[PDB]
Symmetry: C5
Subunit: 259 residues, 5 copies
């Protein structure tokens, strides 16, 4: 694809606005946004997490107005934020008291906040904490794992092309690919790390590369992907569940001619 001029005129711009809901495991009918309580295997080789205990990447494929000269929608800017940050102030709902007579412990600990915008599915590379982990039916996970999968095994390539499927802990954006995607993520690990969640409607991320070209939407589809694992909630027994929140996306696109 040789990239040519941007179209102008009223017809030449469009906006996508939506929310991606978290997929933390959803153990039952009352626990949307939460994982199952975390259990710990007694050996590496017996690590067999249930599906409902594994957060997954979220993805939405958004159809854009049909275009076909070959024109493609080009993603130019992003506004994004985590929705519902203040819900983490509920420290009165079956939580483990911080001390005698104290309030409930807030959600805290290991977090992963991630978003991407691309003109095609996010491309993934698998990396495993423990190559002998047995991933459950209904998830899509690195196959033919070997001990090298604990550091780098280039066989583990995938596309984030399905919801509730790709577990967060197995997969990262592939930096050898993703030419047509812009991705951003932070892992903050550690049992006691505080969530620090900023909101504002005044911040924009520009999606143009160094040559002034943003993601180009193949087949007139925009791909949005997210993970917002905020930490763990600790119930009165001490059991811990991951808690996630939804992410808002607003993307501005323009028409671009290509050869």
């Amino acid at each position: 694809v040789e990239v040519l001029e941007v179209k102008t005129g009223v017809d030449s711009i469009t906006e996508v606005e939506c929310f991606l809901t978290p997929e933390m495991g959803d153990p039952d009918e009352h626990f949307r946004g939460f994982s199952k309580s975390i259990s710990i295997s007694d050996t590496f080789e017996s690590d067999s997490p249930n599906r409902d205990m594994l957060p997954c990447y979220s993805v939405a494929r958004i159809p854009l107005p049909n275009l076909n000269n070959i024109l493609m929608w080009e993603a130019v800017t992003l506004k994004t934020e985590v929705i519902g940050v203040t819900s983490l102030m509920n420290v009165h709902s079956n939580g483990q008291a911080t001390h005698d007579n104290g309030a409930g412990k807030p959600v805290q600990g290991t977090s992963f906040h991630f978003f991407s915008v691309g003109g095609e599915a996010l491309e993934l590379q698998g990396v495993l904490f423990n190559y002998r982990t047995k991933y459950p039916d209904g998830t899509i996970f690195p196959k033919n794992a070997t001990v090298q999968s604990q550091v780098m095994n280039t066989e583990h390539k995938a596309y984030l092309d399905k919801n509730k499927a790709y577990p967060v802990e197995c997969w990262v954006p592939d930096p050898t690919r993703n030419e047509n995607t812009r991705y951003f993520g932070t892992l903050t690990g550690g049992e006691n790390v505080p969530p620090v969640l900023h909101i504002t409607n005044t911040a924009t991320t520009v999606l143009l590369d160094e040559f002034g070209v943003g993601p180009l939407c193949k087949g007139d589809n925009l791909y949005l992907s997210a993970v917002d694992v905020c930490g763990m909630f600790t119930n009165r027994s001490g059991s811990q569940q991951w808690r996630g929140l939804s992410r808002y996306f607003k993307v501005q696109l323009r028409k671009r001619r290509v050869k």
Copy 2:
């Protein structure tokens, strides 16, 4: 409305200055700025917080000079938390940090938030637990379902009343608020330290990317805030939210519109 030129001349600018007081729950006649002590439900299903245990959003609607088309446009903001040093009172019925030590200071989960707009802040509801029974006297997401724990688009509201909209149920709606600028930070965790900066030298510009600030419908400016600074721990170990007031200074100019 088409946005045309800014009016100039001495008559063409005005300033609003005020303080919004915090609404932390105010459990009795002596506890302004504090919530009731926090209690924990025995199960998720039985979460039923009392009103006086729930911090709410603060809002003030400020009448501007009558323009009876011109609209007042909010251009700049200075803001800070007022009374930050009060949190140095570590001698007032606090739980000692250790034997013979001073009282524990206010610390833990905080939410610091402010907005300036030409109409009421628009809110979206998100619930930690959709089975929480919110108390009479509050305005809370209705017809809550399990989807309310992540996103239920039925939960829309306007921040149009004080002591009413609990902080934990509501956030600014990012799908709306075109005529408001909002900023907030949640810092979660029971041992988080307050970090509170004050200065009269810092200004926030409210203009969007097109150079246009919030336009004040009906000559009213809307200021909203939350400043939950953390929790105070009493000698018994019981904990209450503590909030502080927020100062706002907004400069406005007259803008012609069609």
Copy 3:
């Protein structure tokens, strides 16, 4: 009405000084420290002694007499003096663990400074409106429950040393048009002091119109608080510890009408 700056040889001057901390100074050996902190039994009975309450520091500095011209404060260099003294972990401290070094100064801090052409203006806010503030301090009078959040009756000028308790008063953001102030409260029992020193950092005091504080009566007002945290002695008792603050201010002559 602010007009042009005067230029020429004698059109500039500088002020340099240090402000010592006023942490309560419980006896002849404890300058820079408060008394050990005691905790009241109830809210209603909170009654801190004077020597347990850090206060704001202030110095009024006379400038070369211009007797209209006024001295205009343009730049500030400032820093906390004696930061390395906090490495004394061997002087009657509480050991951090068995056989360990003494606990360093840490926990709640307030670092504040201002430069103005008149006294810093203060607004009172009380943690607990029923606190009985001690004789010898200047504190919010006629306190009500509203004083816990905002009572606009509580206005004062920082016009006296060893007098205005830090915990009762803050700069009044509705006033202070002729002062530039800066402060950070870092709360929490275990926060680490982070104290930077350098002679290479300058703060410009000019407002958005290019005008700095104008010194009424040819006096410059400098104010400070540097409560660095608490020192924990062997017994567990805790005292606030403060340090002095250096100020260097450059001023120029400005004509006004």
Copy 4:
């Protein structure tokens, strides 16, 4: 060398893209990316770490297209690969508390990378000069008590994998004119990993004269360490855990005399 002009044209640029795997010790066939559990010596004189307990620097020598012209390294994109793997808190980890999840990888980390036109030059510094380093490693020789602060005899080249222990060696600041290096040690038992990923960030490798590393013999040297912290198993024993690092380097042809 006198550095002259950059060549232009489609033929004048090339790219290198690769990953460097971590070398943490790899104690057996199941533990690639981990060290052996850490044991503590009973005295300074008995410090005798086994080879599989010692993380080492990673290095790749990347041959470039044969070319006086030299390849000049201009830009770098880099990131840690597999950051989300640290969310496995269900695999034989010590619980945070009764009934809790497993502890994540945390504690002391070192994240380091360099790009150069020749091997990274190293200076040896020892925590304890009486440490006996194991066979199969390359370590400072003829160590003396001065090796604990600076012994200029301890000079080496990062010229072999799985060989140079992280704890014994640092980039030599007195050399390395033809390399750009970047590192952060974050020490402490409980420090959290903070790992950022993005494909939108570039580091420029040019010095203040506009010249990047020049690749002698048409070789590019990439080096890394990414000790992320320690994993604690159910027994309490701790192992270093490392992750791979991605490098993408753009190079241009430069004439030199």
Copy 5:
């Protein structure tokens, strides 16, 4: 001095490169880089630290090429040497918990460096004015309770090694016109070392008038402190641990009258 033009020509610039070793106390022949174990007095009045328990400021006077012209210091590159040595958590440390690795160096740190055309000027500030400083050290004399906040009698030059204890001296902000200094005290028993290394970072030493330190008698003065934290041994006892600092300074010839 009136400062006139900079000389040009290849002969007009010179470079100084060196390292300053830390002086942490060096309690015996195996503990270079460490202090003596830290002990704690029973009272403020009985604080009497051993010489070998007191870290001191490091200084080097560097003769420059003989030169009215003066060498002007223009830029500095600096970094702490040996940061990875703190990854030795296997040498007689105290285990973080049962079966765990040794605690890393952590706790109170002071990182400081200065470049000047004359000795660094010091001001004394004492945590406890009754501290008895040991023979062999140069300390604030005639101390009074005011010495705990500011006593202007305590002036000195950093003109000798292994002499000026860190805890009782700071740079004098009222002087040091011909020096640039930078430092950070990070206090608290659990603070994590955060130590960055790179050969790509330069500090410019020029003041607001474009004038760097001017080297009187063709001598450049470099000063440093890098107390990284404390090492905790098996018994729980703690020693300060320091590291060396690299300096590279570029200078140019400046004419003066």
